[PDB]
Structure 1
């Protein structure tokens, strides 16, 4: 750590403090996260999971029982960008470009059997060139917001799949379009009931095996499903169809990142430049 000069506090992550810092030898500006042997090995495997839509893990430093993760630095996160764009809304071609790029990043990690598990706007990082990148990939395996949590996790599935990331990204896509969180739960039951109130209480018809899940209760209220036309106006039919497939209850029916990239919604995808004031 004597090789780094702290510049400013980026924020407080799930694991520890994140600083913007300067590497004293290379002159490199990085993000430094201050955090068992199985953790060392899993984190070391993440150093090889390189993709243009994944924030680069430059180095892993284990000293005096403290673990430091050195990452590529980006100037802005999507949460702050969405707040800054609240009055006008993020233009649809930019939303579409960001969703396309995030799906490319997920398709890559998922092809390597690596899940994010905790996607949220705060860990999606953006630059002046129009890129968007996933941060904290694979750290979950190695107040916390529930808004993006998949229903199978809320229902107590211990062995969840890559579909949990598609659910989180669908929630984020809806929030970029409407300028409001889709399911802003403030407890696990409030989160689950908000999902049920919009998508309908799940049953054996739409989700075989749901009633056998660890935290499923037959006493859950039974709410009717709402039309996506009410949920995400003014999104077009291609976007609503894609979002519906990213929000399927059954993780097995939920669209994969690779199949989502082929969706007609992306026929006219482009890579616009965001308006960024740094």
Structure 2
């Protein structure tokens, strides 16, 4: 018996279809699950519109985190700019049966589902560019100094289509977000999208969201994750396959440098020695993004050969932007305002 019967063994509310809450919300169905809890589809009879309700887990640590999310959402949603409409609208929140409930506008499926619908062939470069320009505008909005918000968990699952059959998107799930002054975690971001500074245990800022976006944009067009580590060591080695050893000035300041690397007598860094010399990774920098993208050979896996909107010039512009988003140095990684000025977005 958990929560007088309303909860399961995992601090989640046992969702029951057709239930009416507070003589206002008619619960249609469960639409998603997460570590935070659940999201249900409901009808708001008062405002006479469909809404999405995020049911936070009935547990203190998750509740405390969702309060941070509420503060950041309300701060973004009230800002006086047009750029704020790339962030999901939090309509209201309430406590119900000892669960914090966040009521959002109803959106459509996420960009992972969209990838699944192409059977992981990836979406067109033209559609990728549309996602990239919106996400860049969103990161610019998060970067306005009064906000200074780090999403901290950008991934295809947290970018949603507004309408299933249009290209407009919004960012959701600010559950792990923080502001530039108020960072409280060290193990952050979903692993595939985790920045080098986080893996190395170094200080981080809004630039970690730009790293995630670079990884996301490649995956949206190729259909598969750029860096699919099974654990942190595997994740760092997969980044090194594509981008080489991180530069010495970063590793010299990285608290977790020796989790992946060793410093040589001359002050240069290499990967840690592997067991009995067992070969597992491409040598550093030899898994070229130029070839992952198929810049000159018809796109990813050659699947865009003979298609418009996929010229070598297009791919070269795309690759340059991605590499600027994946700069090892968070101080020189491209920032949203300048990313928006990139030749990849000239049309």
Give the structure-1-normalised TM-score: 0.87
Native 8 Å contact 1:114 1:138 kept in 2: no
- 1:156 partnered with 2:201: yes
- 1:261 partnered with 2:324: no
Could you tell me how far 1:20 is from its partner in structure 2?
1.4
Secondary structure of 1:212 counterpart: coil
- 1:123 partnered with 2:147: no
Aligned alpha-carbon RMSD (Å): 2.2
Matches within 5 A, 1:37-186: 40=67, 43-50=70-77, 51-63=84-96, 65-86=98-119, 88-111=121-144, 112-126=147-161, 127=163, 128-137=165-174, 139-141=176-178, 145-157=190-202, 159-186=203-230
Q: State how far apart, in whole Å, the 2-side matches of 1:96 and 1:38 are.
A: 33
Give the structure-2-normalised TM-score: 0.70
- 1:213 partnered with 2:254: yes
Could you tell me how far 1:8 is from its partner in structure 2?
1.7
Stretches of 4+ moved more than 6 A in 1? Answer: none
Q: State how far apart, in whole Å, the 2-side matches of 1:261 and 1:105 are.
A: 11
Residue deviations 1:74-102 (CA, integer Å, cap 9, x gap): 12110000110136531221111111011
Structure having greater relative contact order (Cα 8 Å, sep ≥ 6):
1
Q: State how far apart, in whole Å, the 2-side matches of 1:154 and 1:22 are.
A: 42
Secondary structure of 1:67 counterpart: strand
Residues 137 and 257 (structure 1), Cα distance of their counterparts in 2 relative to 1, 3 Å cut: farther
- 1:241 partnered with 2:301: no
Native 8 Å contact 2:115 2:121 kept in 1: no
Larger Rg: 2
Return 5+ residue gaps in structure 1 as ranges.
269-278
Residues 21 and 91 (structure 1), Cα distance of their counterparts in 2 relative to 1, 3 Å cut: same
Native 8 Å contact 1:29 1:73 kept in 2: yes
Q: State how far apart, in whole Å, the 1-side matches of 2:236 and 2:65 are.
A: 32
Return 5+ residue gaps in structure 2 as ranges.
1-20, 57-62, 78-83, 179-183, 263-269, 273-282, 300-313
